[PDB]
Amino acid sequence: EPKQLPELIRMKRDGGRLSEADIRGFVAAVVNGSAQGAQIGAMLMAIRLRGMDLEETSVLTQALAQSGQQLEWPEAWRQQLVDKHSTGGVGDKVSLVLAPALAACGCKVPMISGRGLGHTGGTLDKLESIPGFNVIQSPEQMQVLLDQAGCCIVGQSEQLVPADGILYAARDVTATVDSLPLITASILSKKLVEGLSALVVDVKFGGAAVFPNQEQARELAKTLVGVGASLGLRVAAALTAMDKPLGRCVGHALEVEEALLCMDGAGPPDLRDLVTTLGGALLWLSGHAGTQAQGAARVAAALDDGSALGRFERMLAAQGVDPGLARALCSGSPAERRQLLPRAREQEELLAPADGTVELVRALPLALVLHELGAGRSRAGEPLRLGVGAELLVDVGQRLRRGTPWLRVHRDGPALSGPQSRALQEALVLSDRAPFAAPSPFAELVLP
Numbered sequence: 001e002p003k004q005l006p007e008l009i010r011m012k013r014d015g016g017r018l019s020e021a022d023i024r025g026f027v028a029a030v031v032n033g034s035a036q037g038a039q040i041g042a043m044l045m046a047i048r049l050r051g052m053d054l055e056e057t058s059v060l061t062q063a064l065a066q067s068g069q070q071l072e073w074p075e076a077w078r079q080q081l082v083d084k085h086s087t088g089g090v091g092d093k094v095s096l097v098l099a100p101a102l103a104a105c106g107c108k109v110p111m112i113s114g115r116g117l118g119h120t121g122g123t124l125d126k127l128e129s130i131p132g133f134n135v136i137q138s139p140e141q142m143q144v145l146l147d148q149a150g151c152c153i154v155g156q157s158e159q160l161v162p163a164d165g166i167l168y169a170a171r172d173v174t175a176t177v178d179s180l181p182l183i184t185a186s187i188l189s190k191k192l193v194e195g196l197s198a199l200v201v202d203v204k205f206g207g208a209a210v211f212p213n214q215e216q217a218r219e220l221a222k223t224l225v226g227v228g229a230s231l232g233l234r235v236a237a238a239l240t241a242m243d244k245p246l247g248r249c250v251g252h253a254l255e256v257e258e259a260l261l262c263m264d265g266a267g268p269p270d271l272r273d274l275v276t277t278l279g280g281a282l283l284w285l286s287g288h289a290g291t292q293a294q295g296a297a298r299v300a301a302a303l304d305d306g307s308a309l310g311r312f313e314r315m316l317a318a319q320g321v322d323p324g325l326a327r328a329l330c331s332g333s334p335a336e337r338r339q340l341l342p343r344a345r346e347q348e349e350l351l352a353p354a355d356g357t358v359e360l361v362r363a364l365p366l367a368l369v370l371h372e373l374g375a376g377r378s379r380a381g382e383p384l385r386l387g388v389g390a391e392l393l394v395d396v397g398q399r400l401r402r403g404t405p406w407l408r409v410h411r412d413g414p415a416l417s418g419p420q421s422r423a424l425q426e427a428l429v430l431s432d433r434a435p436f437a438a439p440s441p442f443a444e445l446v447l448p
Helices: 005-013 020-032 037-050 054-065 095-104 123-127 139-148 162-174 180-194 215-231 253-264 269-285 292-304 307-318 323-331 334-340 363-375 418-425
Strands: 082-085 109-113 151-155 198-205 235-241 346-351 356-361 389-392 405-411 428-431 442-446
Touching (some): 005 037, 095 292, 139 151, 180 215, 198 269, 215 235, 253 389, 269 292
Parallel strands (some): 082 198
């Protein structure tokens, strides 16, 4: 029954299970206001150090979900509601494209997304690079968006998965993100509130992924598919590598550009690879395409013929962006899009030390330095340096020459410190091996 908050915390601290009553009451305290900051962090920490189990976990997610509302849409759309959701992520703008992609493929995507988590920027912050983009819509507005645009991207609020919003902000600045339960709940809860026909989850592994260990990551996959099943959700989880940044831009505004470059015609191969791959899965899974190949084939199609660029345009406008700016952003050249989005003060470039063959660029050192540069959050509720970020000037598998520039840093301060500099420079790994074509960051596809 109603136990005082400090008491539930004492229980988890002591490795005790939380009852459905206990989890619920807690969730409520968090949304109703009673629960104080130091209390929410304490609990998150306790959880990050004693975990929970299938039930508590399943209970948590399930509750979080109902802290707010659930959406209901015209029965017409039903079989067309789909969504994908990542975990880790350094430079993962897939969402910024796969959304309008699917919307061009006749699907409706009601995306409840999020902000940077730990050292992994969020697709919600990235969108806020676009001037006037509102990530907060009421269910009502959302339904207008899936009608006009077919898709939309919004974050937690007073009506949607409220409690998740409270924790998710804390998780990131409390060093309480890497927890299978808090992860499973955080994700499933949002996607639940949407009520989708099919749902694909992006589970990163290696390098800069929340859970580095491939297998210990593959579990997180069978898990989200696990609980997700029970909750009554069709869930497909795919393990994709995260040792190097997806694409060539890590940041916010920079990333919004490398996304437009995709819809345009095509930018980075890996970026496209996943958008089509994951996209084709959703169509197959939602039973909207013969096989994944066919599925994936239609998405690629969207990419190549301006569809996604169109859907995307309606979307920005539909979500607060000055119509004019939006036609300018999409029909704009890359040079235009640069002068229209947030740019950092100065920007230097790291040169190649030795002749050699780019083996890979270390994602973690990057994300970590850029974080220190204002591309990451230090303490919830704070602005973000949206211009700041980084550009990969060489592509993995290729051969570069000593002295050539391989990475450009956009910073808002008067310079990089010694530690930050060395950090960057060593994130570059060179071999004498012969140049080669980059592999797909896509590994397996855990099914339900």
